[PDB]
Design a protein around this ligand. Structure first.
Ligand code: 3PE
Ligand code: ANP
Ligand code: ANP
Ligand code: MG
Ligand code: MG
Lengths: 231, 202, 55, 220, 220, 202
């Protein structure tokens, strides 16, 4: 059963503490397993430990945008208020993950490429995604009247997620056209696979906690006038 | 019976509720006026009636069906002139009104503008017309449209005392033909009280 | 129990790629901590903003 | 009411908004002329960057011209079209986009023979460029329609519209420049025109509905 | 009254929330990234095209912000400043163009270090890029103001009104790109920097008067 | 001798001459209404008076010097509210009214906003104000400004009876001390006939 009154504020506040504790514990375990306990790659040595910082961010940059698309779809067909606040709740987190992926990707390629920005498939497919996130965030912050930002934001998110596979495939083909190919398909090592899983799961829980807190903030911003905020 | 009907319309904007539990039926020949100050939801109610905006609660019914199901047979019988006139400023008066006419045009659009009071300004760009003559361009549609339902939002915004008389006489003979006029204005009507049906935003 | 680095920050904290690895750590910790602090401060400021309009 | 009546009405309105539809053309000419001046008397480098600069100029000209698609409607007459004209709103959006393209994308195709000689292209290069602009600018208009429909109420002609639709045109630019570059090698280009046509068919169907939904959101 | 109040008012009209300040930065980033997707990822080629790319971005931003400057105010409040505000209308125009440069010129100057490595230029290239984006970008608001004021406010205006906005800024772009190319070639740029200083002194002294006269003529 | 004194003013649009030969001097404390049909030169005369537009053939004198010769001693004491209210639609009701005040203490601006009947809408963006609340934002300046000459062009365009009565009382008491109000209204004013000096377009 789904009622979804601003009782959802209490439900969100119920999950934040345990979710935050679990996320912190998982991230710490996954980053102590790496960064000192996992083996080292033979080619690029200790620079390969950035996988635990870049792979989770890159994966969840797409994951959060997919969740935003699902939330926008739910809030469009069924005209649900809170399902449209879910887009604005996860948009800044997705933008931050895209920025983190971009930063950790460039600092990862600096030892090999020699410069801080080589136009690669990985680092540009995560740049158009950052552009989409920025567009959504800017659109949500430009409507004076709420309940219009969130429907317009939902429409923008749906339009972007329709175009997202096309853009990614075009970029993955654009790289093949000019350079002939990228360097090589990055491989994984069995002794260095579990810490990556744990770091990805930790990033998942961290994004969940962050979006719960942001959803609480947005719910208060929406119903800043109702008598149920008499507290 | 029940050409147009409102079914428990609710519209609340932020800390204020505009109206609650509105339920009125409008048969043929009704001259309905919305009453309120500059804060009540008169334009909001009219835009809920036209289908441009969706009500938070309740629904509007045309002839017995919701507005989203008959949105092709409803706009056939409908006439909205809101606070904004809805006419292109850079075009002349004729082709702005030529757009809204189905058939027989440029023989009847000239006659309508003559009745509105723009005889000789049919070929002058609207942006070069006065602030009141710009309203008369939009109000000239009252002499062309065959629509049964007129929903006007302050048609006497900047209309001369002579002009308001002609509009009042226009939407007084349209009614006994079998039309419906939903009016909202602040200047008093120059007609008897029995002719007008006041409804308030309770 | 068994580290991949033999010793302390004499061996750890630089593996030949100290500037590049620790740039990623610092510049991923900073945005996340900024997000957390911003969310907490935003919630508290919204709550203080509720009581101020009761005046 | 009818589709063609709205199309002709918007053409008539756009032809009276002169000096606002000529600014995109001036910007296009300035952009396509600046770079051949930045590079000196070097023919080899010009033939490598001509498609890219041409299509970036086309993107930016369409971006400039997209401002007036729905701008002068919300003030007076964005409604009277959602509110009347029993023709479905997607068809109204289609008519408006067709009329906007006939004054935005069509002029860039008319000046294409004057560009292929300015940049020292051959006949086949101009043929491919014209086929690309003919199949690319309707896609530009259809993709830019939802972005201006969402931001028509915001009343900010500028950067906000340019960060909503510009990322959506990236595949169009990539494939268009790929086709034009492959034309320089006198290699058959049927594999890229097919992708451009697929993009045009895909956007020409969903964009009217997306823009209608956005306009309905923005009108309330 | 209080010219600075006009300046702060125009600043407020653009930005209402702290997160909306960064919109020109993202617009600039997207416009800059539009070129490598078309020209190519090769870094040496992008170094020679950097002046054209950045100045096309600056011109596009100035064009987009110029429409907001006067066309919006005409509908409601382009008056109440000729009629009120006892300070001369040239001062009002000066406030308008200064706020326009703050919303347009400043973000690209702030983003100058970031856009200098995406294109691959060195420190000298960035130095000359900053000195030309600080000394020539304010002009774009100045000499483009008289042109736009006539077009957006003169009813029944022909195409000739658009000849005073885009084709009037060609010398600015020509000298700026020449200076930047001389910078990339590692040549003395002061010959072109002294010229661009004269235009800034030459247009900031007469453009407010010219735009004031244009507004006086057009409002009648 | 005396404030604004139109001297044989002449203006013609298209081919018709709107007026030819106005010569009126407005001394202190006169309430004057510019009467005419919907299409006469009412707004055009007002824009000639405010100095925004130059007369076709003639000159208008403030305090003995033409309006281009002073341009600073006249805009200090002048308050024109035309058909367009002149308010930025994106700002709120406060900072928009804050711009038109001398310093904007926000203690007198709020007092004026509450005085014009727009109490409680002091922080809503003005584009969300309905249709006369937008005009009330523009007309709230009648309580802030110390100008001694009001060129008001159709101020009762969309204001209910209460707001019209409040505005009429305010203008009646302002013109009592030293003020001058040039007014163009199609709704007849509910004040004694001797108070208003009407001048027609000849
Ligand atoms: C490293 C420095 C810090 C990293 C950036 C952290 C930004 C965090 C922003 C944040 O938490 O606020 C969210 C913000 C709007 O907050 P919200 O609560 O929705 O709005 C309030 C009332 N309406 O929503 C936003 O504006 C989201 C913005 C997303 C973009 C993030 C991109 C990071 C850019 C960092 C700039 C510094 C580095 C520049 C380049 C370096 C490389 C050369
Ligand atoms: N550019 C123009 N602006 C305004 N009026 C114009 C223009 N060109 C010609 N005119 C004519 O000027 C005459 C007077 O216009 P205007 O001054 O707006 O009249 P008005 O009686 O004050 N209008 P209103 O307030 O609605 O009753 C009309 O016949 C117009 O058509
Ligand atoms: N976006 C909005 N558009 C219009 N009204 C809004 C909006 N947001 C909130 N409102 C409120 O809607 C209420 C009613 O507006 P509206 O229906 O236009 O009133 P009205 O009585 O028709 N106006 P008026 O014609 O001047 O007498 C007002 O109290 C507004 O503050
Ligand atoms: Mg209303
Ligand atoms: Mg008038």
């Amino acid at each position: 059963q789904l009622a979804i009154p601003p009782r959802l504020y209490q439900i969100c506040g119920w999950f934040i503490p345990w979710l935050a504790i679990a996320s912190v514990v998982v991230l710490t375990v996954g980053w102590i397993w790496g960064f000192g306990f996992a083996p080292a790659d033979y080619q690029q040595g200790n620079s390969y430990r950035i996988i635990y910082l870049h792979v989770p961010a890159a994966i969840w940059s797409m994951g959060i945008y997919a969740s935003m698309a699902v939330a926008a779809f739910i809030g469009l067909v069924w005209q649900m208020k809170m399902a449209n606040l879910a887009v604005a709740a996860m948009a800044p987190i997705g933008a931050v993950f895209t920025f983190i992926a971009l930063v950790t990707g460039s600092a990862w390629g600096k030892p090999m490429w020699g410069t801080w920005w080589v136009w690669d498939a990985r680092l540009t497919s995560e740049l158009v995604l950052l552009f989409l996130y920025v567009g959504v965030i800017a659109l949500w912050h430009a409507f004076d009247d709420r309940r219009l930002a969130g429907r317009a934001a939902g429409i923008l998110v749906l339009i972007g997620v329709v175009n997202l596979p096309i853009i990614h495939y075009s970029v993955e083909w654009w790289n093949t056209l000019h350079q002939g190919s990228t360097r090589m398909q990055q491989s994984i090592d069995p002794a260095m696979r579990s810490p990556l899983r744990w770091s990805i799961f930790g990033f998942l829980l961290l994004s969940a906690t962050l979006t719960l807190m942001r959803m609480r903030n947005l719910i208060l911003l929406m119903e800043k006038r109702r008598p149920w905020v008499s507290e | 019976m029940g050409m147009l009907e409102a079914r428990e319309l609710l519209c609340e904007r932020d800390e204020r509720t505009l109206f609650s539990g509105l339920s009125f039926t409008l048969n043929a020949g009704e001259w309905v006026q919305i009453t309120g100050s500059n804060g009540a939801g008169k334009t909001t109610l009219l835009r809920l009636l036209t289908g441009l905006s969706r009500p938070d609660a309740g629904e509007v019914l045309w002839q017995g069906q919701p507005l989203h199901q008959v949105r092709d047979s409803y706009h056939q019988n409908l006439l909205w002139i809101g606070h904004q006139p809805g006419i292109k400023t850079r075009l002349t008066a004729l082709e702005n009104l030529h757009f809204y006419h189905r058939d027989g045009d440029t023989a009847q659009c000239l006659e309508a503008l003559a009745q509105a009071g723009l005889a000789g300004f049919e070929d002058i760009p609207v942006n070069q017309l006065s602030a009141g003559q710009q309203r008369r361009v939009a109000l000239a549609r009252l002499w062309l449209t065959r629509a049964t339902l007129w929903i006007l939002d302050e048609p006497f915004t900047a209309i001369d005392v002579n002009g308001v008389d002609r509009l009042t006489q226009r939407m007084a003979q349209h009614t006994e033909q079998g039309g419906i006029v939903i009016l909202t204005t602040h200047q008093p009507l120059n007609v008897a009280e029995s002719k007008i049906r006041r409804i308030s935003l309770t | 129990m068994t580290p991949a680095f033999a010793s302390w920050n004499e061996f750890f904290a630089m593996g030949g790629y100290a500037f590049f690895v620790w740039l990623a750590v610092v510049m991923t910790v900073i945005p996340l901590v900024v997000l957390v602090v911003h969310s907490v401060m935003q919630h508290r400021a919204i709550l203080r903003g509720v009581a101020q309009q009761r005046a | 009411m009818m589709f063609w009546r709205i199309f002709r009405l918007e053409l008539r309105v756009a032809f009276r908004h002169s000096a606002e539809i000529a600014n995109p053309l001036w910007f296009f000419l300035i952009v396509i002329t600046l770079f051949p001046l930045s590079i000196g008397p070097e023919p080899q480098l010009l033939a490598r960057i001509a498609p890219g600069i041409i299509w970036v100029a086309a993107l930016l000209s369409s971006l400039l011209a997209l401002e007036r698609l729905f701008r002068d409607d919300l003030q007076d007459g964005s409604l009277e079209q959602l509110m009347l004209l029993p023709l479905p709103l997607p068809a109204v959006v289609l008519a408006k986009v067709m009329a906007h393209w006939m004054v935005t994308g069509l002029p860039l195709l008319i000046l294409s023979p004057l560009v292929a000689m300015l940049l020292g292209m051959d006949v086949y290069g101009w043929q491919v460029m014209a086929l690309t602009l003919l199949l690319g600018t309707p896609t530009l208009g259809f993709l830019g329609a939802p972005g201006v429909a969402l931001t028509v109420g915001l009343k900010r002609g500028g950067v906000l519209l340019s960060i909503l639709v510009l990322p959506l045109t990236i595949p169009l630019l990539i494939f268009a420049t790929a086709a034009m570059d492959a034309a320089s090698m006198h290699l058959p280009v049927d594999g890229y025109l097919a992708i451009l046509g697929a993009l045009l068919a895909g956007t020409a169907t969903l964009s009217p509905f997306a823009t209608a939904a956005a306009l309905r959101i923005s009108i309330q």
